[PDB]
Ligand binder design. Structure first.
Ligand SMILES: Nc1ncnc2c1ncn2[C@@H]1O[C@H](COP(=O)(O)OP(=O)(O)O)[C@@H](O)[C@H]1O
Lengths: 412, 107, 119, 102, 93, 111, 79
């Protein structure tokens, strides 16, 4: 049987929250093309006390100006392939988050934020982000970062120089990130344009084409639900689909989906037999050829990036391979990744593949931990005054962040 | 009740007749390409995966199994006899939907 | 085990490496095929026209035509179109004499002396 | 012109590289072995046996004269200790008349 | 002087794609000119009339495609539709 | 102002041969509608390409069997009238100096 | 099967309007062919016009436009 979601959250509090400790209490605003994760830093305790505002990153204003439905409740999104591009909707989403976040005493900002950004950002869009952040809120200082790198920082034993590969899988894109001694090398770094949203759309299209009768009975919500629970990645795709060819055992492990009920009354309210689509959806990232778009795929991308390195430095970076993101939640992803890595590694070589404790939420935990240990570091954050002396597209070049190139954006 | 009441536009379409929200992502990248990027300078262009040199397998469009045949009448692929009967029994709507799913020479 | 492609050919098209395309047809299915360079020669050596029931060994490339179908007879063994799937995984049993094995290993082409008695 | 040829072997247990003298390269060229075939090599004897193209290229063409085999599930490098027996009469017969070399 | 204009140097240029060693007489050139501009006028007028019927201002790819569907009798219609769709798809990309 | 020297034509970008620019000009000047779309001339050129290719292929095939190396109106006439689709597309047209297809009714044939 | 809905007396009536005295008995089966073919062209256009307007209902003006393109004009139906 299907299940549904909820709504009407109560994320409120007093004017604001300060616990006994230090003067500054920064904010964590982990972004996301799918959903936004927020919550106060809460210094003084390593475990996350109470993350708040776990809502889909979808907003919609009233057609006639009645009200702005921005939180959980057509629809619009501020993101355009993992990079935000909407201005007004981004402002209203931020206003919703701040209003539920406890604006202290009047118009202004509370404390520095540790908002995260895509792996690579065009040097026009971070300018708009900074402008609509400062000139609309006036934060004293803001620091950027990457959610996957923050997750690895949280999962790393301690803050030190580390190297390896980071496998990120999100809503609109996936990334293979080579980090070297705690410094990301954004030169031979690659991404795959396909993500979980495209997989869900593919599964939707397949199920609509399989049952032309009730096309509107199933929607994006049910597709996401089944892709989130009734699916897994295969150790070897061709051999698995060959094994699921015999009829006696094909039905032994098939899943029944009971749609709304009141032919034996099982045509409109069918059972929606799925025994192959539960594997064709997860393997989209591994095999982009399943869609008309042609690309290398996760198996060949990291090969293309790994064969341009000398044998000496390959050993320790392969020794630390990490799986992060949203799509890295299907069971058996670790086995598939380690087998694919074993196929391409030397005969006697060694490797280690690690999966995060919470692949979707460790990004926020890592951002919180990084912000907790860098409040006093005045060389990392971007001061409010610096936005006028600096062109517009300035970065700190700190760890867990992008790379800065010397350039100025002409504009007037 | 709000952080600021003097919010100013950042290049909207209030005056002109352009997109109200912002410039398109394609336009954004086209404008960003005009920057004098250095030869070794990173950007948003040299971050996409290269095209695969490995031939791509063929899979049944109705059952997701290893295909070994085709069909000149519809230009699809199946695996067994019942798959052939089913695909012949299907109308043109599902056929063109399957063709457009994995995009082909047919729109 | 062997892979066998048996069926009636409908149309052959070879361009001017070379690109080839042909459509096989049994009584229960049809299938188009793109030919590699080797198959181009394997089909040009043994002139194959429309309405010919042919059997092909996939692992080798041998064309063994059985006859022509009645459909194209209008305008030399007349065989009907085959039945079942075009591609069959056939299990083949084979027995060989022990003296046969001994004779094969004697010369460069030891099987020749097994008929003429030259061994 | 030619001194040695570097070849790369790969199975579903690892990958290795080998250096071949021109004799072994000639043996490979005689077997009509190109890039993407499953090869068997014995270092002691210099034997070269092509076991067919790998299955991953099976989709390269719809009809190809070649036969395709799966990627081997085993070690690229195999070591064994073998003990060989040979009688004198074998040596006499082998060296008595010009060995066929065919 | 005068740009009398014509497709003479176009249909002839098409000829080499089908028969690389065939010539055209002047009268045949005039015949092909008349044929091509006649078909042009027919298709353009049909698309116009259809757009006016649907109270529209612009004659687009789909309107002229429907005009071709109306005017071309049989398999020529669907084959020309495929040819035009391929041409426009290659033009856009 | 600087512009590209010897810019590529729209016909070459479309992969066709008939002039897309001339077709667009004719559409705009023919007063078929006040505004003319972008892809319409490309589609029309493609259709004209298909028709010309078909008729010329048939005309050349007809002329080859007459042991002649040049297309004349007679070959075009033989090409059109021998194909049912082109015959019904060109039912009400007269080809100058093209003659008539040779056919004799069974009744009028001796014996 | 509905072409047989064009009964024999209906064909007789249609013939009688034309001004013919005697009707062969095998005429009907061929005449039903002509009704079968002449009607297979206007619908070809009538649906197609309908399919241009993104709508799936055959209005009374589409048939008029089809008959006009074919060369048979009729009055009284919004022509
Ligand atoms: N528990 C889960 N099981 C399966 N897929 C998930 C799960 N959680 C998230 N996803 C997938 O991950 C995607 C969201 O990725 P996300 O973490 O938002 O990346 P980012 O934060 O970079 O946008 C969604 O498309 C969703 O399909």
């Amino acid at each position: 049987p299907f299940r549904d979601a909820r709504a009407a959250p109560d994320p409120v509090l007093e004017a604001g929250p300060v616990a006994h400790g230090p003067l500054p209490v920064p904010l964590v605003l982990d972004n996301g093309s799918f959903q936004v994760r927020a919550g106060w830093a809460c210094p003084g305790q390593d475990p996350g006390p109470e993350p708040r505002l776990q809502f889909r990153a979808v907003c919609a204003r009233g057609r006639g100006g009645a009200r702005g439905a921005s939180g959980p409740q057509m629809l619009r999104s501020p993101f355009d392939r993992n990079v935000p591009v909407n201005l007004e909707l981004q402002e209203l989403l931020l206003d919703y988050s701040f209003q539920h976040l406890g604006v202290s005493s009047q118009g202004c900002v509370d404390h520095p934020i540790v908002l995260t950004e895509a792996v690579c950002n065009p040097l026009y869009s971070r300018q708009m982000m900074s402008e609509l952040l400062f000139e609309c809120y006036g934060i004293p200082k803001v620091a950027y970062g990457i959610d996957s790198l923050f997750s690895f920082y949280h999962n790393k034993p301690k803050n030190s120089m580390c190297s390896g590969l980071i496998i990120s899988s999100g809503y609109q894109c996936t990334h293979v990130l080579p980090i070297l001694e705690g410094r990301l090398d954004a030169k031979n770094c690659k991404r795959i344009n396909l993500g979980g949203s495209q997989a869900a759309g593919y599964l939707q299209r397949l199920l609509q084409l399989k049952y032309p009768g009730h096309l509107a009975a199933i929607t994006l919500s049910r597709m996401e639900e089944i892709l989130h629970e009734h699916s897994y990645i295969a150790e070897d795709y061709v051999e698995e689909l060959h094994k699921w060819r015999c009829p006696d055992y094909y039905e032994n492990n098939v899943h029944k989906m009971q749609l709304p009920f009141s032919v034996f009354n099982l045509a409109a309210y069918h059972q929606l037999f799925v025994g192959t689509e539960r594997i064709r959806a997860p393997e989209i990232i591994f095999q982009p050829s399943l869609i008309g778009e042609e690309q290398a795929g996760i198996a060949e991308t990291l090969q293309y990036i790994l064969d341009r390195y000398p044998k000496d430095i390959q050993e320790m970076l392969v020794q630390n391979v990490f799986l992060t993101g949203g799509n890295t939640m299907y069971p058996g992803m670790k086995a598939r990744m380690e087998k694919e890595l074993l196929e391409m590694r030397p005969f006697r070589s060694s490797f280690q593949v690690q999966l995060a404790s919470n692949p979707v939420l460790d990004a926020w935990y890592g951002a919180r931990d990084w912000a907790l240990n860098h409040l006093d570091d005045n060389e990392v954050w971007i001061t409010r005054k610096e936005y006028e002396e600096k062109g517009g597209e300035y970065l700190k070049e700190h760890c867990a962040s992008n790379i800065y190139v010397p350039i100025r954006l002409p504009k007037q | 009740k709000d952080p600021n009441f003097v919010h100013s536009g950042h290049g909207g379409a209030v005056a002109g007749k352009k997109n109200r929200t912002w410039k398109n992502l394609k336009q954004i990248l086209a404008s960003e390409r005009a920057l004098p990027w250095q030869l070794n300078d990173p950007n948003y262009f040299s971050i996409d995966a290269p095209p695969s040199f490995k031939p791509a397998k063929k899979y049944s469009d109705v059952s997701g199994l290893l295909a070994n045949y085709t069909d000149p009448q519809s230009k699809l692929r199946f695996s067994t006899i019942e798959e052939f009967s089913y695909i012949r029994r299907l109308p043109s709507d599902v056929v063109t939907g399957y063709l457009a799913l994995r995009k082909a020479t047919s729109i | 085990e062997t892979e066998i492609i048996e069926g009636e050919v409908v149309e052959i098209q070879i361009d001017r490496s070379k690109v080839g395309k042909l459509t096989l047809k049994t009584t229960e299915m049809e299938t188009i095929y793109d030919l590699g360079t080797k198959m181009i020669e394997s089909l040009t050596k043994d002139k194959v026209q429309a309405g010919d029931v042919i059997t092909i060994d996939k692992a080798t490339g041998k064309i063994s035509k059985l006859g022509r179908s009645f459909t194209r007879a209008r305008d030399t063994k007349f065989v009907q179109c085959p039945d079942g799937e075009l591609q069959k995984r056939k299990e083949v049993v084979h027995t060989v004499s022990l003296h046969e094995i001994d004779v094969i290993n004697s010369r460069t082409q030891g099987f020749l002396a097994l008929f003429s008695g030259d061994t | 012109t030619i001194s040695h040829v570097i070849i790369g072997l790969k199975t579903a247990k690892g990958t290795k590289q080998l250096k071949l003298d021109p004799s072994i390269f000639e043996s490979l060229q005689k077997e009509r072995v190109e890039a993407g075939d499953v090869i068997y090599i014995e270092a002691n004897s210099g034997a070269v046996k092509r076991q067919g193209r790998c299955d991953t290229y099976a989709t390269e063409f719809d009809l190809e004269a070649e036969e395709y085999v799966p990627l081997p599930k085993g070690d690229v490098h195999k070591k064994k200790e073998i003990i060989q027996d040979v009688t004198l009469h074998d040596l006499d017969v082998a060296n008595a008349r010009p060995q066929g070399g065919q | 002087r005068s740009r009398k204009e014509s497709y003479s140097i176009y249909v002839y240029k098409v000829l080499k794609q089908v028969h690389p060693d065939t010539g055209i007489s002047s009268k045949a050139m005039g015949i092909m000119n008349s044929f091509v501009n006649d078909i042009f006028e027919r298709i353009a007028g049909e698309a116009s009339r259809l757009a006016h019927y649907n109270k529209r201002s612009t004659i687009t790819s789909r309107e002229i495609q429907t005009a071709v569907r109306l005017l071309l009798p049989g398999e020529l219609a669907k084959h020309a539709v495929s040819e035009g769709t391929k041409a426009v798809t290659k033009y856009t990309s | 102002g600087k512009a590209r020297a010897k810019a590529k034509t729209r016909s070459s970008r479309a992969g066709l041969q008939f002039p897309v620019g001339r077709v667009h000009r004719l559409l705009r000047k023919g007063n078929y509608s006040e505004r003319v779309g972008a892809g319409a001339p490309v589609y029309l050129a493609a259709v004209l390409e298909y028709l010309t290719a078909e008729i010329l292929e048939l005309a050349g095939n007809a002329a080859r069997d007459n042991k002649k190396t040049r297309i004349i109106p007679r070959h075009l006439q033989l090409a059109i009238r021998n194909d049912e689709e082109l015959n019904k597309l060109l039912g009400r047209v007269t080809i100058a100096q093209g003659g008539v297809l040779p056919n004799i009714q069974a009744v009028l044939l001796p014996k | 099967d509905n072409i047989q809905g064009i009964t024999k007396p209906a064909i007789r009536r249609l013939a009688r309007r034309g001004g013919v005295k005697r009707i062969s008995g095998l005429i009907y089966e061929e005449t039903r062919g002509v009704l079968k073919v002449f009607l297979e062209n206007v619908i070809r256009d009538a649906v197609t016009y309908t399919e241009h307007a993104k709508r799936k209902t055959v209005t009374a003006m589409d048939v008029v436009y089809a008959l006009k393109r074919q060369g048979r004009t009729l009055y009284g139906f919004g022509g």
